[PDB]
Amino acid sequence: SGFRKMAFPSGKVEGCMVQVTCGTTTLNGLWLDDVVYCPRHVICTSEDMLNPNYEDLLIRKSNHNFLVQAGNVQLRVIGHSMQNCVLKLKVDTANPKTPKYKFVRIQPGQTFSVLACYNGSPSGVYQCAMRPNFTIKGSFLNGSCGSVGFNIDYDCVSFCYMHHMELPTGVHAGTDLEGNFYGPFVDRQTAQAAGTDTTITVNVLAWLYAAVINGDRWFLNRFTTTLNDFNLVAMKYNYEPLTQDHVDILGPLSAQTGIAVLDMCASLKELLQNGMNGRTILGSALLEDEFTPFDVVRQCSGVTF
Numbered sequence: 001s002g003f004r005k006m007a008f009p010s011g012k013v014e015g016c017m018v019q020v021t022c023g024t025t026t027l028n029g030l031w032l033d034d035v036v037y038c039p040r041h042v043i044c045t046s047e048d049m050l051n052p053n054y055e056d057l058l059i060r061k062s063n064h065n066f067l068v069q070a071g072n073v074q075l076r077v078i079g080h081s082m083q084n085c086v087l088k089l090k091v092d093t094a095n096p097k098t099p100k101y102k103f104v105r106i107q108p109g110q111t112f113s114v115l116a117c118y119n120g121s122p123s124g125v126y127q128c129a130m131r132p133n134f135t136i137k138g139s140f141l142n143g144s145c146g147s148v149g150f151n152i153d154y155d156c157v158s159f160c161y162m163h164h165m166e167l168p169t170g171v172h173a174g175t176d177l178e179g180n181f182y183g184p185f186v187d188r189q190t191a192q193a194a195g196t197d198t199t200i201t202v203n204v205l206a207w208l209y210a211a212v213i214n215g216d217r218w219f220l221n222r223f224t225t226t227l228n229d230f231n232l233v234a235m236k237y238n239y240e241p242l243t244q245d246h247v248d249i250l251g252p253l254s255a256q257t258g259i260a261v262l263d264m265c266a267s268l269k270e271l272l273q274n275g276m277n278g279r280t281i282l283g284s285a286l287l288e289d290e291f292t293p294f295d296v297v298r299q300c301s302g303v304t305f
């Protein structure tokens with residue numbers, strides 16, 4: 001037992017991390033089949049990042065300007081094209097370590113593992129969540145772009161995230177693997193504001209179910225509440241409004257646990273109105289919202305790859 005913020009095994013993704021160099025800009029790229037995906041700002045200097053015209057800047061670039069290396073073995077770029085805010089570099093050889101993969105655009109609240117790399121080689125891995133305002137609180141130094149976020153289900157690596165920039169607030173933004181930014185962000189070095197962030201209510205409830213599973217039961221209350229009443233309380237504390245879909249996705253936890261979902265929301269209302277009172281839940285003094293119900297069921301089922 002015990003509960004931990006657990007990342008996916010990163011090997012299958014380590015096997016596709018290449019270094020992409022263009023002029024003097026160097027960052028990370030993802031080598032799948034005979035295509036290397038990378039952020040389009042690889043074609044920019046920092047003097048270009050204030051207001052870049054990516055079409056005009058890419059037009060004076062040719063295939064021989066891009067240098068792709070996997071560790072030390074090298075890739076011959078034989079084509080290139082810009083899709084939204086990513087560059088697709090067609091190379092001479094196909095990645096022998098290409099796993100079964102998909103490109104999917106995740107929805108807010110859902111989680112993924114980030115493999116943080118620099119110069120095409122991995123440095124760390126950690127689990128994070130796509131905030132309701134389409135940001136993530138990762139850790140990304142300079143050179144870290146092009147690092148990817150992914151989920152792994154049995155055989156399949158579903159890539160969902162490519163890191164692009166750090167907001168002046170200190171949080172991070174990126175695109176899906178088709179180059180479309182999550183949220184209202186542009187790959188431009190200017191002031192960009194994320195919206196009001198809110199807490200992923202269903203995730204907090206899944207984490208409380210995990211807590212009940214692992215022995216911590218002090219927050220377990222005796223009230224229940226209406227869905228509308230809990231939503232009244234949740235909107236005051238800047239929580240996302242709970243829908244019947246959320247209650248349905250919490251069904252397995254509510255059944256293994258024996259605690260009806262609405263009573264768990266009653267306990268959560270009590271925690272929001274009275275605080276945690278100096279105690280902890282699963283080693284945390286705050287209400288954790290970066291576990292989806294599926295993450296809890298994974299850690300309790302020992303789902304493997």
Ligand SMILES: NS(=O)(=O)c1cccc2c1C(=O)C(Nc1ccccc1N1CCNCC1)=CC2=O
Nearest residue numbers: 041044045046142143144145164165187188189
């Ligand atoms: N010559 S470069 O094109 O600025 C550059 C050079 C090396 C590595 C990176 C960058 C990037 O931009 C970049 N993404 C980005 C996107 C929009 C606005 C600013 C940035 N960055 C943030 C990190 N500091 C440099 C500016 C990621 C990198 O890993």
